[PDB]
């Protein structure tokens, strides 16, 4: 081997994870306190989602989801169950998002979103209801309230101009009104993490953390209002959006970061930001693999020294390929077919090396991510008193959900890092739609 030494750079000892855990908890602490909130890399954003909901509206709700690659519009119906509110998606539709909108101005993009909304309401006999609308908007936002806050900055390659710094919900509003076609009561805006968390509440009241491991990666959790300094008040709990994707932007990860991570960064829409998410999320995983594969070929270890034109283009090793290669059964048959598609003609040993390379990146993501989560869960242990903390974490995201063994490595490692917690993991059913709408419903009791 010169291979195993190159791949071994990805490993993390147990003390590595603990270091990142402890540093993350610190950054969480700093994000929450008035003296350090402004400059904290982990912003710890109040969301105005609050504990003891205590009764809500019912009937139909409309939810949008922007921040996945697609954009989704759905109808969710909310009624009364014993536990709290049931809910269920009843109509749905995805809309691609043209790059002439994406490079656009903000108000352009929310016009495109407005067009999609009318389209959906035609096709459904619906233009003539003014519906309450919960909006899952998966980007960092500083809220003033449950229905108002500014975009701090775009992440995950999004770039529409003139949105950073404005009232995202006002954008939505000035597009709906800017096209007469329909009436919509925008009652609530939430992060994906919060929506996921909230949708697990009906079947499990201990769900107090939501986590997304998808294109991007983040979590949110329920904090003690006393510890949330940026919202006056000391009673109860408010869900906080940690935005942990940005941990490492004040150099907290420098010692772990690798030449490949240094290159995914430089070449990205958002250089110097979202460093932690860059090690874990699906927008970056394939690309890390691609760069590891390129270093192996330049070392002559792989495809003996030569790479197709595709292999050399940014973006070509799709994250979904990372997870198909790790599903190969041992016959190389689907490793072969992916490599053959990118214009390579690999040998037996090429296929194995390529698989080793995917394992190395995905195992590191799983481990890095387990340290953030045990950071959050051990912080919650601190504030609390039963001898064993039992807690449920709601999760969503194609990496966590669909990658062949990421979830189990990730569960094994969160559990090493969390003695005397007992953790249940729930994969959210339609977390984002039902979530927005579950919150929307409680927000409505405070307005209509
Ligand atoms: C069903 N909706 C909720 C369920 C639970 C919780 S907190 C909790 N308690 N145990 C676990 N968890 C997470 C909050 C909400 C909620 O929507 N709260 C809102 N407050 C405002 C002001 C608007 S919406
Ligand atoms: O969508 C998953 C996560 O992606 C990136 O972290 C976004 O900044 C975040 O807000 C969202 O929660």
Q: For residues 313 and 366, state if they share a domain.
A: yes
Atom 8 (ligand 2) nearest CA: 139
Query: Is there a domain that residue 284 lies in?
Result: yes
First to last CA, the chain: 68
**C-alpha 420 to ligand 2 mean position (Å):** 29
- Torsions phi, psi of 6, nearest 5? -60, -45
Range of the domain at 216: 1-46+203-429
CATH at 328: 3.40.367.20
The experimental method is X-ray
E strand or H helix that includes residue 433: helix 431-445
Contact yes or no for 213/366 (Cβ under 8 A): no
- Among 155, 211, 319, which residue has the most ligand 2 atoms within 8 Å of its CB, making it the best to mutate? 155
Query: Is there a domain that residue 447 lies in?
Result: no
Separation in Å, CA 148 to CA 95, 142, 144, 263: 25, 8, 6, 36
Please tell me the distance from the alpha carbon of residue 13 to that of residue 252, in angstroms, as a whole number.
17
Q: For residues 28 and 128, state if they share a domain.
A: no
240 is in an annotated binding site: no
Strands 184-190 and 237-241, bridge-based pairing: unpaired
18 is in an annotated binding site: no
Separation in Å, CA 18 to CA 152, 218, 275, 416: 30, 19, 18, 10
243 is in an annotated binding site: yes
Please tell me the distance from the alpha carbon of residue 426 to that of residue 89, in angstroms, as a whole number.
18
Helix (H, G, I), strand (E, B) or coil at 417: helix
Q: Which of 43, 111, 156, 396 is catalytic?
A: 156
- Pocket of ligand 2 contains residue 193 by CB under 6 Å: yes
What's the DSSP call for residue 388?
S
Please state the separation of Cα 4 from the chain's center in Å: 31
- The total domain count for the chain is 2
Separation in Å, CA 117 to CA 22, 193, 235, 310, 399: 44, 23, 39, 37, 29
Compute the Cα dihedral for 387, 427, 216, 132 and give only its sign. Answer: negative
Under 8 Å CB-to-CB from 232, ≥6 apart: which residues?
none
| Tokens 């408010």, located at residue | 238
Q: For residues 163 and 275, state if they share a domain.
A: no
| Tokens 């980007």, located at residue | 139
Instruction: Report which of 15, 1, 17 is spatially closest to residue 356, judged by C-alpha positions.
Output: 1
Please tell me the distance from the alpha carbon of residue 434 to that of residue 431, in angstroms, as a whole number.
6
Say whether 192 is catalytic. yes
DSSP result, 257-274: --HHHHHHHHTSSSTTS-
Retrieve residue 424's tokens: 């249940």
Please tell me the distance from the alpha carbon of residue 117 to that of residue 7, in angstroms, as a whole number.
47
Under 8 Å CB-to-CB from 315, ≥6 apart: which residues?
286, 287
Q: For residues 313 and 184, state if they share a domain.
A: no
Contact yes or no for 328/334 (Cβ under 8 A): yes
Strands 85-95 and 148-151, bridge-based pairing: unpaired
Q: For residues 316 and 341, state if they share a domain.
A: yes
Contact yes or no for 65/436 (Cβ under 8 A): yes
Say whether 156 is catalytic. yes
Q: For residues 319 and 296, state if they share a domain.
A: yes
Resolution of the experimentally solved model in angstroms: 2.5
Q: For residues 235 and 321, state if they share a domain.
A: yes
């Amino acid at each position: 081997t010169l291979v195993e030494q190159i791949l071994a750079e990805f490993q993390l000892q147990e003390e590595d994870l603990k270091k990142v855990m402890r540093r993350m908890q610190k950054e969480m602490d700093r994000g929450l306190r008035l003296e350090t909130h402004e400059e904290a890399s982990v912003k710890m954003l109040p969301t105005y989602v609050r504990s003891t909901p205590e009764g809500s509206e019912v009937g139909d709700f409309l939810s949008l989801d922007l921040g996945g690659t697609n954009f989704r519009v759905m109808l969710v119906k909310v009624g009364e169950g014993e536990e709290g509110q049931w809910s269920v998606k009843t109509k749905h539709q995805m809309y691609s998002i043209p790059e002439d909108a994406m490079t656009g101005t903000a108000e352009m993009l929310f016009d495109y979103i407005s067009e999609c909304i009318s389209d959906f309401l035609d096709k459904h006999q619906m233009k003539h209801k003014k519906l309450p609308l919960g909006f899952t908007f998966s980007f960092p936002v500083r809220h003033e309230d449950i229905d108002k806050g500014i975009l701090l900055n775009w992440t995950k390659g999004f770039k529409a101009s003139g949105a950073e710094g404005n009232n995202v919900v006002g954008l939505l509003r000035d597009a709906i009104k800017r096209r007469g076609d329909f009436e919509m009561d925008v009652v609530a805006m939430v992060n994906d993490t919060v929506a996921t968390m909230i949708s697990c509440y009906y079947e499990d009241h201990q769900c107090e953390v939501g986590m997304i491991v998808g294109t991007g990666c983040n979590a949110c959790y329920m904090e003690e209002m006393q510890n949330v300094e940026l919202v006056e008040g000391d009673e109860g709990r408010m869900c906080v959006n940690t935005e942990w994707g940005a941990f490492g932007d004040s150099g907290e990860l420098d010692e772990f970061l690798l030449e490949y991570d240094r290159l995914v960064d430089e070449s990205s829409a958002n250089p110097g930001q979202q460093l932690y998410e860059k090690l874990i999320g699906g927008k970056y995983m394939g690309e890390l693999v691609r760069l590891v594969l390129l270093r192996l070929v330049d070392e002559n270890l792989l495809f003996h020294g030569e790479a197709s034109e595709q292999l050399r283009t940014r973006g070509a090793f799709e994250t979904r390929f990372v997870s198909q290669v790790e599903s190969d059964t041992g016959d190389r048959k689907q490793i072969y077919n992916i490599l053959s598609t990118l214009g390579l003609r690999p040998s037996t040993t090429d296929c194995d090396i390529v698989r080793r390379a995917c394992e190395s990146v995905s195992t590191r993501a799983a481990h890095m991510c387990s340290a953030g989560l045990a950071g959050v869960i051990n912080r919650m242990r601190e504030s609390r008193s039963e001898d064993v903390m039992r807690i449920t974490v709601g999760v969503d995201g194609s990496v966590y959900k669909l990658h062949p063994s990421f979830k189990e490595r990730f569960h094994a490692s969160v559990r090493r890092l969390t003695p005397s917690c007992e953790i249940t993991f729930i994969e959210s059913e339609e977390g984002s739609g039902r979530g927005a709408a579950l919150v929307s419903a409680v927000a409505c009791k405070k307005a209509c």
